[model samples]
Target: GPGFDYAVAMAKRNIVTATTSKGEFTMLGVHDNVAILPTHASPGESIVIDGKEVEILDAKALEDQAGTNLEITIITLKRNEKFRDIRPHIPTQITETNDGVLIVNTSKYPNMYVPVGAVTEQGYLNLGGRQTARTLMYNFPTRAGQCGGVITCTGKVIGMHVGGNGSHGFAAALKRSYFTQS
Candidate 1:
């Protein structure tokens, strides 16, 4: 499944411009079938400039500044999925595992782990053998198919690829400053 097309646009300071033969055009961060073409002073002909501002070739130049415009076709973002999947469970079942909860997964979800601490830090967190809090119904990564990793949705380390069944993971947790709720 592969397809492709050509896009012709003026490269001013390494940025795509919207000036075209038809009219001016603007594009979103995520757009398909979009092309940045130069404005044409005549019909059915490409615009040409001989060191004169006969036509505003580069819109960005009009502002007296040149910058690199990054065209990103962002299909989806992690934050978006977090809101859709991890915003339900908050105060009851998984209640943010006491500061130093010591979490680990049984090699189900690889490449994910959480150290016991400010959940804000990077890394995976484990959910020790509990089904209630494990439910994916909420944001906790205890559910059967939950993959562990640092995320804003669950706030709990969903899973860990490293540090399972090792003192290093525990040691790492201890190194991090965590305060128990008790």
Candidate 2:
């Protein structure tokens, strides 16, 4: 009963992270307090949201491969009623009908902006010998720490940032079970 709730919550919710003070996001939904921060979210670290510090309950990283340091993490915290109230159900779809998606850039910290030009590559990116789906890259540059940022086509959550090469960033497609299963 202690943490059983969080266990189920994760399976249904997106395999997202809260890195920024955790990554730049004010739109994602979360539990009253529990925060599964954006990927690359450092564990055993401290916290200072706004001006307050939320105590860490537990922190763990699920890395896809070694050396790459690509992973998603969770950090527990107090519940923000409003935050939880409007947590959006990230749908997985794309705008193959249209071009250019959106990137919630949070690396700057001083501000968060959606980068321009949204090319959603249909093919897969091979990471450590594994072929990951939907290589979502932006026309502009993205921070290395922006690893866990989610990519959206229209209003639906389409892909997630893993890592990048050249100007292209590697994001896992969400419409299918590509990122969910393995």
Candidate 3:
């Protein structure tokens, strides 16, 4: 029941609050000064992290076929030096073979307080006049300022927080192309 050690470890070091004069959201850190935020987070040349304004290096779609709102933004900044070189353990291999509940957050919080939710759907449908997302979850605690948060399973980032209505939450799948695409 969501007592994942890796998720706990990463939550402490990888999470950060991203803010602009207009809004704020959570962002996740990876190796080599690389961090990612959902493009849906907000618009601005730079975002305030840890009280310092950090410029965005670039932005790109997580899935090549996804729409712009489903895209992710890349940033290189200095935060927890301990986690600076720590990269997320994505499920490139077959290691993430467990069926379990997942974890998510709106801001930095104690590991015990992180919300646990289970996947309810994947491959979002953008029906007319309806919200579009890449992944979906149920019983996932989400609120304002939660978008851009990471949704991790088996210690790897499986998706990202987009938006949710408390009854359900949505996310964009975390893809390798997010770090490789041009």
Provide the overall lDDT of each model, using Cα atoms, as 2-decimal numbers. Answer: 0.21, 0.44, 0.58
Better of 1 and 2 by TM-score: 2
As a TM-score, model 1 comes out at 0.16
Error of 3 at 172 (Å): 1.0
lDDT by residue for model 1 over 41-119, one digit each (tens)?
A: 1112232222212232123100101322111111121111111121121132222233322222223432233334433
Candidate 1 wrongly placed segments (more than 4 Å): 1-84, 90-109, 120-148, 151-182
lDDT by residue (tens digit), candidate 3, 1-182:
34366666667777776786546667777665677777666546677876777765554434434442555667655433434444436544212223433344443432333445455465554656554545555456566666676666665666666766756666666655456322
Instruction: Give Cα distance to truth, residue 39, candidate 2, Å.
Output: 3.4
Between prediction 1 and prediction 2, which has the larger lDDT? 2
Query: What lDDT is reached at residue 88 by model 1?
Result: 20
| TM-score of candidate 2 versus the correct structure, residues matched by position | 0.53
The TM-scores of all predictions, comma-separated, are: 0.16, 0.53, 0.73
lDDT of 2 by residue, 62-180 (tens): 44444332233545654343243213434444333133343343435322334445555655456677554445555545556555555544434555566665666666444432123
Error (Å) of candidate 3 at residue 135 is: 1.9
Decide which is better by lDDT, 1 or 3: 3
Q: CA shift at 78, candidate 2, in angstroms?
A: 3.2
